[PDB]
Amino acid sequence: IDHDTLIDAGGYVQKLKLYPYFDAAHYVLTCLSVRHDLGPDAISFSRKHPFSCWLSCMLMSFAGSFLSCFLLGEPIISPLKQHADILLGSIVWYLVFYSPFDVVFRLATWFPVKLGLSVLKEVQRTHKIAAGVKHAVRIYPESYLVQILVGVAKGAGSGVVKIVEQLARGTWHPTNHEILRPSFTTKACVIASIVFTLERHSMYVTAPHDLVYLCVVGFFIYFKLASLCLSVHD
Amino acid sequence: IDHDTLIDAGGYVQKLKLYPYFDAAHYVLTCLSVRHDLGPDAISFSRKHPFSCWLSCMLMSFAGSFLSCFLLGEPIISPLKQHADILLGSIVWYLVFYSPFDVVFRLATWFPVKLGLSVLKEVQRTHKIAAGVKHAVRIYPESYLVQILVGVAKGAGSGVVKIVEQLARGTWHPTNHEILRPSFTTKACVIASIVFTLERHSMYVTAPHDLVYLCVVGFFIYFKLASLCLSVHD
Amino acid sequence: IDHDTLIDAGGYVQKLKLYPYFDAAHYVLTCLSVRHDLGPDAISFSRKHPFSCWLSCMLMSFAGSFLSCFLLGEPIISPLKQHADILLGSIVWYLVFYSPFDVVFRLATWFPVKLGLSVLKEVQRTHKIAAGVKHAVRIYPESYLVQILVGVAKGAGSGVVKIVEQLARGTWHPTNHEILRPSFTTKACVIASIVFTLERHSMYVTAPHDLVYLCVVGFFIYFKLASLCLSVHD
Ligand SMILES: CCCCCCCCCCO[C@@H]1O[C@H](CO)[C@@H](O[C@H]2O[C@H](CO)[C@@H](O)[C@H](O)[C@H]2O)[C@H](O)[C@H]1O
Ligand SMILES: CCCCCCCCCCO[C@@H]1O[C@H](CO)[C@@H](O[C@H]2O[C@H](CO)[C@@H](O)[C@H](O)[C@H]2O)[C@H](O)[C@H]1O
Ligand SMILES: CCCCCCCCCCO[C@@H]1O[C@H](CO)[C@@H](O[C@H]2O[C@H](CO)[C@@H](O)[C@H](O)[C@H]2O)[C@H](O)[C@H]1O
Ligand SMILES: CCCCCCCCCCO[C@@H]1O[C@H](CO)[C@@H](O[C@H]2O[C@H](CO)[C@@H](O)[C@H](O)[C@H]2O)[C@H](O)[C@H]1O
Ligand SMILES: CCCCCCCCCCO[C@@H]1O[C@H](CO)[C@@H](O[C@H]2O[C@H](CO)[C@@H](O)[C@H](O)[C@H]2O)[C@H](O)[C@H]1O
Ligand SMILES: CCCCCCCCCCO[C@@H]1O[C@H](CO)[C@@H](O[C@H]2O[C@H](CO)[C@@H](O)[C@H](O)[C@H]2O)[C@H](O)[C@H]1O
Ligand SMILES: CCCCCCCCCCO[C@@H]1O[C@H](CO)[C@@H](O[C@H]2O[C@H](CO)[C@@H](O)[C@H](O)[C@H]2O)[C@H](O)[C@H]1O
Ligand SMILES: CCCCCCCCCCO[C@@H]1O[C@H](CO)[C@@H](O[C@H]2O[C@H](CO)[C@@H](O)[C@H](O)[C@H]2O)[C@H](O)[C@H]1O
Ligand SMILES: CCCCCCCCCCO[C@@H]1O[C@H](CO)[C@@H](O[C@H]2O[C@H](CO)[C@@H](O)[C@H](O)[C@H]2O)[C@H](O)[C@H]1O
Ligand SMILES: CCCCCCCCCCO[C@@H]1O[C@H](CO)[C@@H](O[C@H]2O[C@H](CO)[C@@H](O)[C@H](O)[C@H]2O)[C@H](O)[C@H]1O
Ligand SMILES: CCCCCCCCCCO[C@@H]1O[C@H](CO)[C@@H](O[C@H]2O[C@H](CO)[C@@H](O)[C@H](O)[C@H]2O)[C@H](O)[C@H]1O
Ligand SMILES: CCCCCCCCCCO[C@@H]1O[C@H](CO)[C@@H](O[C@H]2O[C@H](CO)[C@@H](O)[C@H](O)[C@H]2O)[C@H](O)[C@H]1O
Ligand SMILES: [Mg+2]
Ligand SMILES: [Mg+2]
Ligand SMILES: [Mg+2]
């Protein structure tokens, strides 16, 4: 009965209310990333330049939406009108950098938890890509390429914003073969985006959409979990 | 009677017609900055690539307006439609880089003068922030955050444009602890912006607006004059 | 009879249907450039990251249009709606990086051919600038400056996009006096742009427009051919 069960699981995941737990997971991981990139002085830095620190995290937390607006010519500022989102994001940021005894940070970096957060984040990423594709389809019905790129921007735009932040923080530097970091994330966002676009135009995808959705989420979680448990071979 | 006098001084400064003297002060200082950043070959460089040099100065001279348009999704080109402004800016730029015997440059870098120009510039910056907040309020009445960010963009956006220019000129490089430059400008623009935003929504500011205005300008001039007379302790 | 013949040649060149041969020439040269900038591992790189490689070439192939939209506040994505163009561009890109035995690449880099392609590209660049000016004139009838800048953006915007790509690829680095590369391209686009703008407002240009057009194209081809045959003195 798998294929009837799987179909239900897919519709299940696809209907999950992301706010506020799946969103918070993404914010937490995003803040941890900004904190890791800030260095050993991260805490001193955050206490001396809170506005800058807060900004660095908000930009990364909503990177996909900023890039998306940029591509579509919508006010870059748009995302900041999701008051609930910005508030939740600022609270997480406050907790990650300033919780007493740094408990939040310590709890979030404990492997079992970081792993649970990563799963929730992948679920949320899949939703961002799908939403991005749907939004693009409503604006440019016949532009398959735009639809795909927008979907990818919503799912992997953090890379662009990171560069922007490292330039503004004066730390950007070439990345010419320092280490071998095998990341399939953005390539996976491309595939997911194409798949959702095709699905939206009912073409090569004859499979039940709720099942395809399950597979996309499944692959995201897989590749993500693989890189977390491993280091160089999956 | 101070508080009646002060109130008048505040309304006074707030009504000052910025064009063309307060504007020219800002243009002069902006051009001097681009010239200092260009190096020893600045003059040879400017004589070989005048269009590029002119562009570098216009971008910096109107940085706040370009960033503002960028954030609001308005044509980035908008600022260039202020013919009088662009003309005055181009004239100042021409004089700073090409005046015979370099008199303009020499006069502008003479401490007493550079100090007078700095005062006028701070007065103009305060007006940019306030105007930015008002503009944002008219477009997004309930978005306090957007209003603040726009105000800050109008007051401290030159930092973004500078990076853009150093990338286009091929000179950008990390700024990892070369020297200890204590600049409170942008942090002050943040405060000023918040204050004007609050003031616009008549909340925590029970003080006479014209008096608050005086304080903001006063603090800008102070922090600015402090950094000019000092080097590492104020 | 030259001046009657020349006038005809000018109207001639100006009416040339750019698609698909003049366009393909530009795409081919653009792809060769991205390939040269990718290095010795270019081929391995392209086979491991095709989506990224394809993107790098599309961004450069339509750089002028992306910058133009950016300046005018039009959706940055707009250019991708020229399906025929994007298809032709993707096909050229596919052929340049993956043709069997690399014949396309080998044929395109054979001096006589690269020289022929360069001529066609210069013809196309002239058309981009003129189109850019006309577009700007229709939107902002009295903004001479905007009209000129837009024209220049359409003709020399690839420089901006290149920087963007080197940042995203993690290879950007200062260009502080490594070699002496004498490029007059963008300075020539500035002149061409001013000339077309003036021409559009029927001012200082009393010369037959079709003749001026011929001269502009002629100068582009000249400066371009000069740099190709030479290395340091023309
Ligand atoms: C409720 C809304 C509150 C948020 C409002 C908007 C927040 C303001 C964002 C800009 O913050 C700036 O960030 C810079 C860093 O990019 C700091 O540069 C300072 O700190 C840097 C390092 O972080 C140094 O490199 C610089 O030299 C030094 O000037 C600067 O002080 C700070 O003001
Ligand atoms: C100097 C920077 C400091 C910024 C301070 C400004 C904060 C302004 C908050 C005013 O509106 C808030 O809206 C929140 C929602 O966004 C509410 O949260 C409550 O309501 C939300 C739903 O509206 C739920 O999500 C929350 O979990 C629940 O705590 C909260 O009660 C309410 O006061
Ligand atoms: C990175 C480290 C992680 C940071 C740590 C912060 C985690 C916060 C855990 C919140 O746990 C929630 O607590 C709610 C109470 O606030 C519960 O509400 C539920 O139970 C309440 C009673 O306890 C009822 O009043 C509510 O209506 C019912 O929704 C809800 O089930 C539970 O998930
Ligand atoms: C530290 C890492 C480990 C953390 C793992 C815990 C994650 C907690 C996030 C909770 O997410 C919620 O899950 C609910 C279910 O429990 C969903 O109920 C929803 O979905 C159900 C079906 O799955 C329906 O039956 C319900 O009616 C409907 O409210 C709801 O949308 C979703 O926000
Ligand atoms: C009335 C309106 C008039 C203004 C119209 C628009 C002005 C044109 C802006 C672009 O100017 C370009 O600036 C580049 C610099 O960013 C120069 O690069 C040249 O100079 C650089 C150094 O400044 C070098 O690094 C480069 O290699 C070299 O090609 C290039 O020659 C020049 O054309
Ligand atoms: C190759 C680059 C060279 C660019 C040359 C193109 C210049 C075009 C100027 C034509 O319009 C100008 O407008 C100026 C105003 O912007 C006037 O200045 C006069 O009028 C202004 C007010 O309109 C005052 O601000 C000035 O101080 C006063 O000199 C000036 O008379 C007038 O000719
Ligand atoms: C960085 C180095 C600084 C660069 C040096 C350039 C400074 C230019 C100084 C201008 O001084 C102005 O001269 C005006 C004359 O052009 C005067 O007009 C005034 O006086 C004129 C008579 O002199 C009358 O005709 C006018 O109506 C009356 O407005 C005005 O008061 C005075 O401020
Ligand atoms: C080298 C550095 C040292 C330079 C210092 C000199 C600065 C000169 C800038 C002149 O600024 C003007 O000041 C006028 C006053 O003199 C103002 O008159 C205006 O404001 C007055 C009140 O202050 C009113 O009484 C007037 O009617 C009204 O025209 C006018 O707006 C303003 O542009
Ligand atoms: C029909 C439409 C198809 C096109 C859809 C959109 C194409 C997707 C564009 C982004 O492609 C990304 O480019 C990155 C490069 O900028 C790659 O980074 C990888 O490769 C880089 C080198 O090229 C390394 O520096 C990075 O560390 C490494 O993660 C990444 O894998 C790849 O996904
Ligand atoms: C995974 C990435 C792979 C992408 C595959 C998607 C391609 C979709 C193609 C469908 O429409 C195409 O339009 C082309 C035009 O753009 C046509 O070319 C033909 O028609 C054109 C004019 O429409 C001419 O320019 C061409 O030379 C001629 O081959 C072609 O027949 C037709 O099928
Ligand atoms: C960088 C290396 C370069 C890459 C190599 C790819 C170059 C492709 C060459 C195409 O040559 C074209 O072939 C067409 C045929 O497909 C001809 O059509 C013409 O001749 C055909 C018969 O051969 C007729 O059917 C057509 O109607 C008539 O338009 C056309 O004249 C000719 O220019
Ligand atoms: C490897 C480098 C060397 C490659 C050099 C070969 C370049 C081939 C590109 C062909 O460009 C076409 O030339 C046609 C002429 O042959 C033009 O016919 C057009 O223009 C003619 C006038 O020039 C008119 O008579 C025609 O009716 C009209 O169709 C047409 O627009 C244009 O696309
Ligand atoms: Mg949704
Ligand atoms: Mg005003
Ligand atoms: Mg045309």
PDB file of C-alpha atoms in Angstrom, chain B residues 24-220:
ATOM      1  CA  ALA B  24      28.427  71.988  -2.551  1.00  0.00           C
ATOM      2  CA  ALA B  25      30.102  71.322   0.812  1.00  0.00           C
ATOM      3  CA  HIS B  26      28.990  67.696   0.598  1.00  0.00           C
ATOM      4  CA  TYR B  27      30.127  67.433  -3.054  1.00  0.00           C
ATOM      5  CA  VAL B  28      33.509  68.974  -2.236  1.00  0.00           C
ATOM      6  CA  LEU B  29      34.150  66.595   0.646  1.00  0.00           C
ATOM      7  CA  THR B  30      32.910  63.636  -1.412  1.00  0.00           C
ATOM      8  CA  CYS B  31      35.291  64.526  -4.274  1.00  0.00           C
ATOM      9  CA  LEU B  32      38.210  65.009  -1.913  1.00  0.00           C
ATOM     10  CA  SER B  33      37.483  61.520  -0.616  1.00  0.00           C
ATOM     11  CA  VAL B  34      37.446  59.970  -4.081  1.00  0.00           C
ATOM     12  CA  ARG B  35      40.667  61.843  -4.837  1.00  0.00           C
ATOM     13  CA  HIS B  36      42.356  60.591  -1.669  1.00  0.00           C
ATOM     14  CA  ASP B  37      41.234  57.038  -2.464  1.00  0.00           C
ATOM     15  CA  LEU B  38      42.619  57.330  -6.009  1.00  0.00           C
ATOM     16  CA  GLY B  39      46.189  57.717  -4.794  1.00  0.00           C
ATOM     17  CA  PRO B  40      49.337  59.669  -5.858  1.00  0.00           C
ATOM     18  CA  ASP B  41      48.466  59.253  -9.533  1.00  0.00           C
ATOM     19  CA  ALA B  42      45.010  60.726  -8.883  1.00  0.00           C
ATOM     20  CA  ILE B  43      45.648  63.703 -11.146  1.00  0.00           C
ATOM     21  CA  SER B  44      47.195  61.712 -13.987  1.00  0.00           C
ATOM     22  CA  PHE B  45      44.381  59.199 -13.579  1.00  0.00           C
ATOM     23  CA  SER B  46      41.715  61.899 -13.750  1.00  0.00           C
ATOM     24  CA  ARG B  47      43.245  63.441 -16.857  1.00  0.00           C
ATOM     25  CA  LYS B  48      43.394  60.088 -18.656  1.00  0.00           C
ATOM     26  CA  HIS B  49      39.950  58.824 -17.595  1.00  0.00           C
ATOM     27  CA  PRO B  50      37.741  61.889 -16.998  1.00  0.00           C
ATOM     28  CA  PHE B  51      34.450  60.119 -17.680  1.00  0.00           C
ATOM     29  CA  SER B  52      35.315  57.383 -15.195  1.00  0.00           C
ATOM     30  CA  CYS B  53      36.545  59.939 -12.666  1.00  0.00           C
ATOM     31  CA  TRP B  54      33.405  62.040 -13.097  1.00  0.00           C
ATOM     32  CA  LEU B  55      31.270  58.919 -12.645  1.00  0.00           C
ATOM     33  CA  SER B  56      33.101  57.811  -9.516  1.00  0.00           C
ATOM     34  CA  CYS B  57      32.342  61.185  -7.950  1.00  0.00           C
ATOM     35  CA  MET B  58      28.708  61.384  -9.005  1.00  0.00           C
ATOM     36  CA  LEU B  59      28.035  57.899  -7.620  1.00  0.00           C
ATOM     37  CA  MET B  60      29.524  58.848  -4.277  1.00  0.00           C
ATOM     38  CA  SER B  61      27.969  62.310  -4.266  1.00  0.00           C
ATOM     39  CA  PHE B  62      24.499  60.826  -4.544  1.00  0.00           C
ATOM     40  CA  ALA B  63      25.134  57.445  -2.925  1.00  0.00           C
ATOM     41  CA  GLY B  64      22.342  57.801  -0.380  1.00  0.00           C
ATOM     42  CA  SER B  65      19.786  58.479  -3.107  1.00  0.00           C
ATOM     43  CA  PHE B  66      20.950  55.562  -5.254  1.00  0.00           C
ATOM     44  CA  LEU B  67      20.787  53.129  -2.349  1.00  0.00           C
ATOM     45  CA  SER B  68      17.392  54.506  -1.370  1.00  0.00           C
ATOM     46  CA  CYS B  69      15.979  53.954  -4.874  1.00  0.00           C
ATOM     47  CA  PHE B  70      17.522  50.497  -4.887  1.00  0.00           C
ATOM     48  CA  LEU B  71      15.720  49.575  -1.649  1.00  0.00           C
ATOM     49  CA  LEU B  72      12.354  50.965  -2.747  1.00  0.00           C
ATOM     50  CA  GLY B  73      12.470  49.487  -6.236  1.00  0.00           C
ATOM     51  CA  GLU B  74      12.511  52.893  -7.925  1.00  0.00           C
ATOM     52  CA  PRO B  75      14.610  53.407 -11.071  1.00  0.00           C
ATOM     53  CA  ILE B  76      18.239  53.528  -9.875  1.00  0.00           C
ATOM     54  CA  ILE B  77      18.714  56.309 -12.390  1.00  0.00           C
ATOM     55  CA  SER B  78      16.146  58.605 -10.697  1.00  0.00           C
ATOM     56  CA  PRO B  79      18.653  60.862  -8.871  1.00  0.00           C
ATOM     57  CA  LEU B  80      20.160  61.972 -12.207  1.00  0.00           C
ATOM     58  CA  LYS B  81      16.926  63.803 -12.956  1.00  0.00           C
ATOM     59  CA  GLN B  82      17.803  66.519 -10.452  1.00  0.00           C
ATOM     60  CA  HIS B  83      19.526  68.561 -13.150  1.00  0.00           C
ATOM     61  CA  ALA B  84      20.507  71.432 -10.875  1.00  0.00           C
ATOM     62  CA  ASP B  85      22.069  68.962  -8.410  1.00  0.00           C
ATOM     63  CA  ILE B  86      23.967  67.017 -11.056  1.00  0.00           C
ATOM     64  CA  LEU B  87      25.231  70.226 -12.616  1.00  0.00           C
ATOM     65  CA  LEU B  88      26.442  71.638  -9.292  1.00  0.00           C
ATOM     66  CA  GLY B  89      28.020  68.275  -8.507  1.00  0.00           C
ATOM     67  CA  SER B  90      29.807  68.082 -11.842  1.00  0.00           C
ATOM     68  CA  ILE B  91      31.087  71.651 -11.465  1.00  0.00           C
ATOM     69  CA  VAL B  92      32.483  70.942  -8.011  1.00  0.00           C
ATOM     70  CA  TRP B  93      34.080  67.743  -9.336  1.00  0.00           C
ATOM     71  CA  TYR B  94      35.608  69.672 -12.240  1.00  0.00           C
ATOM     72  CA  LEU B  95      36.980  72.297  -9.873  1.00  0.00           C
ATOM     73  CA  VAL B  96      38.345  69.778  -7.364  1.00  0.00           C
ATOM     74  CA  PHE B  97      40.269  67.817  -9.982  1.00  0.00           C
ATOM     75  CA  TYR B  98      41.138  70.458 -12.579  1.00  0.00           C
ATOM     76  CA  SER B  99      41.239  73.986 -11.102  1.00  0.00           C
ATOM     77  CA  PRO B 100      44.444  75.749 -12.237  1.00  0.00           C
ATOM     78  CA  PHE B 101      47.329  75.525  -9.773  1.00  0.00           C
ATOM     79  CA  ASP B 102      44.909  73.225  -7.941  1.00  0.00           C
ATOM     80  CA  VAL B 103      43.660  76.168  -5.833  1.00  0.00           C
ATOM     81  CA  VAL B 104      40.277  74.687  -5.073  1.00  0.00           C
ATOM     82  CA  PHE B 105      41.839  71.477  -3.790  1.00  0.00           C
ATOM     83  CA  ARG B 106      44.417  73.406  -1.744  1.00  0.00           C
ATOM     84  CA  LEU B 107      41.781  75.681  -0.266  1.00  0.00           C
ATOM     85  CA  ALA B 108      39.414  72.798   0.547  1.00  0.00           C
ATOM     86  CA  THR B 109      42.087  70.778   2.330  1.00  0.00           C
ATOM     87  CA  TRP B 110      43.209  73.677   4.528  1.00  0.00           C
ATOM     88  CA  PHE B 111      42.060  72.504   7.977  1.00  0.00           C
ATOM     89  CA  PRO B 112      39.969  75.560   8.952  1.00  0.00           C
ATOM     90  CA  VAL B 113      38.014  75.220   5.696  1.00  0.00           C
ATOM     91  CA  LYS B 114      37.738  71.436   5.704  1.00  0.00           C
ATOM     92  CA  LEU B 115      36.314  71.900   9.185  1.00  0.00           C
ATOM     93  CA  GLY B 116      33.755  74.440   8.028  1.00  0.00           C
ATOM     94  CA  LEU B 117      32.731  72.205   5.147  1.00  0.00           C
ATOM     95  CA  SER B 118      32.309  69.263   7.503  1.00  0.00           C
ATOM     96  CA  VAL B 119      29.857  71.234   9.614  1.00  0.00           C
ATOM     97  CA  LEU B 120      27.733  72.133   6.602  1.00  0.00           C
ATOM     98  CA  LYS B 121      27.859  68.524   5.421  1.00  0.00           C
ATOM     99  CA  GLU B 122      26.571  67.224   8.746  1.00  0.00           C
ATOM    100  CA  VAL B 123      23.660  69.651   8.536  1.00  0.00           C
ATOM    101  CA  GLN B 124      22.870  68.286   5.074  1.00  0.00           C
ATOM    102  CA  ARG B 125      23.160  64.641   6.169  1.00  0.00           C
ATOM    103  CA  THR B 126      20.559  65.216   8.899  1.00  0.00           C
ATOM    104  CA  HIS B 127      18.196  66.569   6.261  1.00  0.00           C
ATOM    105  CA  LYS B 128      18.809  63.535   4.008  1.00  0.00           C
ATOM    106  CA  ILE B 129      17.893  61.111   6.777  1.00  0.00           C
ATOM    107  CA  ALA B 130      14.748  63.054   7.720  1.00  0.00           C
ATOM    108  CA  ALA B 131      13.690  63.311   4.084  1.00  0.00           C
ATOM    109  CA  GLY B 132      14.328  59.605   3.641  1.00  0.00           C
ATOM    110  CA  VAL B 133      12.103  58.764   6.593  1.00  0.00           C
ATOM    111  CA  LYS B 134       9.328  61.059   5.377  1.00  0.00           C
ATOM    112  CA  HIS B 135       9.486  59.556   1.885  1.00  0.00           C
ATOM    113  CA  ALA B 136       9.284  56.016   3.287  1.00  0.00           C
ATOM    114  CA  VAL B 137       6.393  56.958   5.576  1.00  0.00           C
ATOM    115  CA  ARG B 138       4.395  58.238   2.615  1.00  0.00           C
ATOM    116  CA  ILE B 139       4.893  54.964   0.714  1.00  0.00           C
ATOM    117  CA  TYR B 140       4.721  52.388   3.536  1.00  0.00           C
ATOM    118  CA  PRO B 141       2.777  54.052   6.399  1.00  0.00           C
ATOM    119  CA  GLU B 142       2.953  51.054   8.759  1.00  0.00           C
ATOM    120  CA  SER B 143       6.417  49.665   8.033  1.00  0.00           C
ATOM    121  CA  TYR B 144       8.535  51.135  10.825  1.00  0.00           C
ATOM    122  CA  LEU B 145      11.527  49.007   9.868  1.00  0.00           C
ATOM    123  CA  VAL B 146      11.507  50.042   6.212  1.00  0.00           C
ATOM    124  CA  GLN B 147      11.193  53.677   7.296  1.00  0.00           C
ATOM    125  CA  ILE B 148      14.250  53.365   9.514  1.00  0.00           C
ATOM    126  CA  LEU B 149      16.384  51.509   6.966  1.00  0.00           C
ATOM    127  CA  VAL B 150      15.541  54.021   4.251  1.00  0.00           C
ATOM    128  CA  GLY B 151      16.541  56.842   6.588  1.00  0.00           C
ATOM    129  CA  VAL B 152      19.841  55.113   7.283  1.00  0.00           C
ATOM    130  CA  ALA B 153      20.399  54.437   3.571  1.00  0.00           C
ATOM    131  CA  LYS B 154      20.000  58.141   2.810  1.00  0.00           C
ATOM    132  CA  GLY B 155      22.445  59.046   5.567  1.00  0.00           C
ATOM    133  CA  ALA B 156      25.123  56.344   5.322  1.00  0.00           C
ATOM    134  CA  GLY B 157      24.798  54.723   1.893  1.00  0.00           C
ATOM    135  CA  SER B 158      28.154  56.007   0.672  1.00  0.00           C
ATOM    136  CA  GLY B 159      29.793  52.939   2.212  1.00  0.00           C
ATOM    137  CA  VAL B 160      28.015  50.627  -0.189  1.00  0.00           C
ATOM    138  CA  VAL B 161      28.799  52.698  -3.258  1.00  0.00           C
ATOM    139  CA  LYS B 162      32.446  52.997  -2.251  1.00  0.00           C
ATOM    140  CA  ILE B 163      32.790  49.197  -2.304  1.00  0.00           C
ATOM    141  CA  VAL B 164      31.121  49.149  -5.713  1.00  0.00           C
ATOM    142  CA  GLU B 165      33.655  51.669  -7.020  1.00  0.00           C
ATOM    143  CA  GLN B 166      36.682  49.875  -5.601  1.00  0.00           C
ATOM    144  CA  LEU B 167      35.493  46.703  -7.306  1.00  0.00           C
ATOM    145  CA  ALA B 168      35.000  48.475 -10.637  1.00  0.00           C
ATOM    146  CA  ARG B 169      38.387  50.175 -10.261  1.00  0.00           C
ATOM    147  CA  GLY B 170      39.992  46.857  -9.383  1.00  0.00           C
ATOM    148  CA  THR B 171      41.382  47.982  -6.031  1.00  0.00           C
ATOM    149  CA  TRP B 172      39.082  46.445  -3.420  1.00  0.00           C
ATOM    150  CA  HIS B 173      40.814  44.426  -0.727  1.00  0.00           C
ATOM    151  CA  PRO B 174      39.946  43.054   2.727  1.00  0.00           C
ATOM    152  CA  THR B 175      40.106  45.453   5.662  1.00  0.00           C
ATOM    153  CA  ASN B 176      41.205  42.917   8.280  1.00  0.00           C
ATOM    154  CA  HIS B 177      42.619  45.000  11.149  1.00  0.00           C
ATOM    155  CA  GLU B 178      44.967  47.299   9.199  1.00  0.00           C
ATOM    156  CA  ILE B 179      44.285  50.279  11.450  1.00  0.00           C
ATOM    157  CA  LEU B 180      41.730  51.173  14.127  1.00  0.00           C
ATOM    158  CA  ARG B 181      39.324  53.669  12.567  1.00  0.00           C
ATOM    159  CA  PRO B 182      36.612  54.653  15.113  1.00  0.00           C
ATOM    160  CA  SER B 183      33.676  55.885  13.011  1.00  0.00           C
ATOM    161  CA  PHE B 184      30.312  56.482  14.699  1.00  0.00           C
ATOM    162  CA  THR B 185      28.667  57.982  11.609  1.00  0.00           C
ATOM    163  CA  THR B 186      26.443  55.106  10.500  1.00  0.00           C
ATOM    164  CA  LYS B 187      25.594  54.081  14.060  1.00  0.00           C
ATOM    165  CA  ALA B 188      24.579  57.741  14.541  1.00  0.00           C
ATOM    166  CA  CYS B 189      22.495  57.633  11.330  1.00  0.00           C
ATOM    167  CA  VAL B 190      20.715  54.584  12.752  1.00  0.00           C
ATOM    168  CA  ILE B 191      19.851  56.433  15.957  1.00  0.00           C
ATOM    169  CA  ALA B 192      18.852  59.580  14.080  1.00  0.00           C
ATOM    170  CA  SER B 193      16.690  57.490  11.769  1.00  0.00           C
ATOM    171  CA  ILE B 194      14.934  55.668  14.603  1.00  0.00           C
ATOM    172  CA  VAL B 195      14.347  58.994  16.359  1.00  0.00           C
ATOM    173  CA  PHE B 196      12.815  60.620  13.282  1.00  0.00           C
ATOM    174  CA  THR B 197      10.692  57.560  12.640  1.00  0.00           C
ATOM    175  CA  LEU B 198       9.372  57.560  16.200  1.00  0.00           C
ATOM    176  CA  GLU B 199       8.887  61.300  15.947  1.00  0.00           C
ATOM    177  CA  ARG B 200       6.839  60.736  12.785  1.00  0.00           C
ATOM    178  CA  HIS B 201       4.552  58.359  14.663  1.00  0.00           C
ATOM    179  CA  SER B 202       4.441  60.623  17.712  1.00  0.00           C
ATOM    180  CA  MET B 203       5.392  57.975  20.241  1.00  0.00           C
ATOM    181  CA  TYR B 204       8.238  58.023  22.767  1.00  0.00           C
ATOM    182  CA  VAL B 205       9.304  61.507  21.654  1.00  0.00           C
ATOM    183  CA  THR B 206       7.423  63.961  23.861  1.00  0.00           C
ATOM    184  CA  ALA B 207      10.154  66.533  23.301  1.00  0.00           C
ATOM    185  CA  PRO B 208       9.649  69.456  20.881  1.00  0.00           C
ATOM    186  CA  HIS B 209      10.588  68.119  17.442  1.00  0.00           C
ATOM    187  CA  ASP B 210      12.567  71.245  16.546  1.00  0.00           C
ATOM    188  CA  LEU B 211      14.610  70.665  19.688  1.00  0.00           C
ATOM    189  CA  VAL B 212      15.223  66.992  18.918  1.00  0.00           C
ATOM    190  CA  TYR B 213      16.309  68.063  15.468  1.00  0.00           C
ATOM    191  CA  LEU B 214      18.823  70.440  17.020  1.00  0.00           C
ATOM    192  CA  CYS B 215      20.201  67.642  19.180  1.00  0.00           C
ATOM    193  CA  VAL B 216      20.567  65.268  16.235  1.00  0.00           C
ATOM    194  CA  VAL B 217      22.433  67.849  14.177  1.00  0.00           C
ATOM    195  CA  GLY B 218      24.448  68.742  17.266  1.00  0.00           C
ATOM    196  CA  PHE B 219      25.521  65.165  17.839  1.00  0.00           C
ATOM    197  CA  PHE B 220      26.438  64.701  14.177  1.00  0.00           C
TER     198      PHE B 220
END
